[PDB]
């Protein structure tokens, strides 16, 4: 499932080059979303919301430098970035209208908005605390070696550690918590397919975990993953 | 009945809000007073209504309460957040934004998810509670009336507490279940089903209470 993910994010490469040039967070997420959706239904909105701020700081240095500069750029965003991000979300998928109007009115930038998200929201928490999960994921990969194997090991690691907010919202808190327990016991390749197939038959896709795996890859790449 | 008994403990908080008219401290005092010896959802719905108890009819009460909500300040938000925490870093972070952006109770509810029934109600003039009250008034004053409103609402609105615990799917199923359940025992069936499943539609209950109040004030016989 790495393939699908790699192609679809790669449809957004022109948007990413634009972000590296203009450093425009909101617009960036929105362009990325519109772009990699030109011709497809997986999207991965969260991957873009995670990656665009890191890409906007592509030249800050290594992986700790990027994350810090991305947090700093996030704090200097304005309410229009929030509005773009919100529009990107709706396209990914008068309540939106009322939210948009309060974002506007109170001038709630993307950082401040993210500080008001619930604790289960992993991407929000990355946007606010300097990308701590992505960095930990990057360090995991780096201790491994440049391989697809490492990326898989990363994925199951994140799967056993963080209940997926998308799963929480679809299947409920207890089913999300249960994934972490099944993940930590899915060690062989066979055990892992079982799980994948259970998640599928159930309609439970841990999108955020894959999102975080991607942002971790990005940091590990910038750090030097040899 | 258990719910009546459950609310009654907050009665002095209700009397206090009727005179003092401060929504947030009202919710917070109701929550603390109910704990002695969505409890929370019910109070968040009732307090604004109760602070407008003397506005007149049910339409006047809802509209007066919407207005009081609009004239709220960030402190009302802070009090409701404390009331919620008392009732269920990140909360310190949300409080931080509320204080700093001076987000009042109405503005805060305006940023809530689509599915948040109580937020909707605080923002749009208690539309659901109004409809509920009209349901009661054309039905007549009894327990069958209240029981009927409950399942009616249960069939109509997925309950956000159920969503958050069991997820969007199970909650959507409740409505459809409730839609079927007509008989004294079919409803007994659904309730037992929910109990063992650990799902409680507390928001449906809250909304039934807010409807009742508005129907009482309109004149319900
Ligand atoms: Cl810049």
| CATH number of the domain encompassing residue B79 | 1.10.4200.10
Contact B8, B36 (CB under 8 A): no
Q: Does B170 touch chain A (CB under 8 A)?
A: yes
3-state secondary structure of B161: helix
Phi, psi of B163 (to 5 degrees): -45, -60
Please state, in angstroms and rounded to a whole number, the distance separating the CA atoms of residues A5 and A33. 13
Domain that holds residue A131: 1-226
Cα A77 to ligand 1 centre (Å): 9
Max CA-CA distance within chain A? 53
Residue A225, helix vs strand vs coil: coil
B111 interaction partners in chain A (CB closer than 8 Å) = 98-99, 102-103, 116
Q: Tell me the H-state helices in B71-142.
A: 74-85, 90-100, 105-109, 117-124, 127-139
How far, in Å, CA of A17 to CA of B158, rounded?
A: 43
Spacing, Cα A72 to ligand 1 middle (Å):
9
Give the contacts of B163 (CB within 8 A, at least 6 positions apart). A169, B115, B171
Distance A25 CA to ligand 1 centre (A): 10
C-alpha B178: how far from chain center: 19
Put simply, the answer to whether B93 touches A103 (Cβ < 8 Å) is no
User: Which residues of A are less than 8 Å from B94 in CB distance?
Assistant: 115-116
Per DSSP, the three-state class of B50 is helix
Residue among B44, B46, B65 at smallest CA distance from B213: B46
Distance CA B171, CA B194 (A): 10
- Helices and strands of chain A, counted as H and E runs: 15, 0
d(CA A32, CA A9): 8
User: Which residues of chain B are within 8 Å of residue A205 when distances are taken between CB atoms?
Assistant: none
The helix/strand/coil state of A60 is coil
Tokens 């449809």 found at: A11
Q: Whole-angstrom Cα distance, residue B9 to residue B42?
A: 13
Cβ <8 Å between B90 and A119: yes
Residue A49 token pair? 């919301």
| A:61-120 residues touching chain B, CB 8 A cutoff | 95-96, 98-99, 101-103, 105-108, 112, 115-116, 118-119
Residue A73 CB contacts under 8 Å (≥ 6 apart), including other chains: A23, A25, A53, A56, A57
The nearest CA of chain B is from the CA of A37 a distance in Å of 25
Maximum distance among all Cα pairs of chain B, rounded to whole angstroms = 53
- The C-alpha atoms of residue B39 and residue B131 are separated, in whole angstroms, by 22
A178 in B contact zone (CB under 8 Å): no
What's the domain count of chain B?
A: 1
Q: What are the angstrom distances between the C-alpha of A82 and each of A29, A44, A90, B51?
A: 10, 18, 12, 35
Q: Give the distance from residue B101's alpha carbon to the nearest chain A alpha carbon, in angstroms.
A: 6
| Cross-chain Cβ contact B111/A128 below 8 Å | no
Select the residue of B94, B120, B170 nearest A115 (Cβ to Cβ).
B94
Residue with tokens 């892992």: A192
Q: Where are the beta strands (DSSP E) in B15-104?
A: none
How far is Cα A163 from Cα A173, in angstroms, rounded to an integer?
8
CB of A119 within 8 A of CB of B128?
no
Reference A120, options A67, A174, A86, A166; nearest CA is A166
Residue whose C-alpha is closest to residue B94's, from A104, A121, A210 = A121
Contact between B169 and A173 using a beta-carbon 8 Å cutoff: no
The CA distance from A191 to A183, in Å, is 9
Instruction: Say which residue the tokens 């009081």 belong to.
Output: B68
Residue reference for tokens 């790699």: A6
CB contact under 8 A, B103 and A106: yes
Header resolution in angstroms: 2.3
Q: Which residues of A4-33 are buried (b: 16+ CB within 10 A; e: fewer)?
A: ebeebbeebeebbebbeeebbbbbbbbbbb
Number of Cβ atoms within 10 Å of the Cβ of A145: 10
Strands (E), chain A: none
Taking only Cα atoms into account, the Rg of chain B, rounded to an integer number of angstroms, comes to 17
Closest CA to A144 of A135, A133, A153: A153
């Amino acid at each position: 499932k790495f393939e699908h993910f790699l192609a679809s994010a790669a449809g957004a490469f022109p948007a990413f080059l634009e972000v590296a040039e203009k450093r425009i967070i909101g617009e960036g997420v929105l362009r990325a979303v519109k772009e990699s959706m030109r011709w497809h239904e997986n999207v991965h909105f969260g991957a873009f919301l995670l990656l665009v701020p890191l890409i906007s700081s592509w030249d800050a240095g290594g992986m700790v430098d990027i994350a810090e500069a991305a947090r700093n750029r996030l704090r200097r965003t304005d309410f229009r970035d929030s509005l773009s991000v919100l529009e990107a979300f709706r396209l990914s998928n008068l309540k939106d209208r009322k939210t948009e109007e309060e974002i506007a009115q109170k001038k709630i930038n993307l950082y401040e908005w993210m500080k008001m998200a619930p604790e289960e929201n992993l991407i929000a928490r990355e946007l606010v605390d300097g990308f701590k999960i992505s960095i930990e994921g990057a360090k995991f990969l780096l201790s491994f070696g440049n391989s697809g194997k490492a990326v898989v090991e990363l994925y199951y690691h994140l799967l056993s550690k963080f209940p997926d907010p998308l799963v929480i919202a679809k299947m409920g808190r207890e089913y999300a918590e249960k994934i972490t327990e099944w993940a930590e016991k899915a060690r062989t390749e066979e055990e892992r397919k079982e799980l994948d197939e259970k998640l599928l038959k159930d309609g439970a896709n841990p999108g955020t975990i894959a999102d975080l795996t991607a942002s971790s890859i990005f940091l590990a790449l910038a750090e030097g993953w040899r």
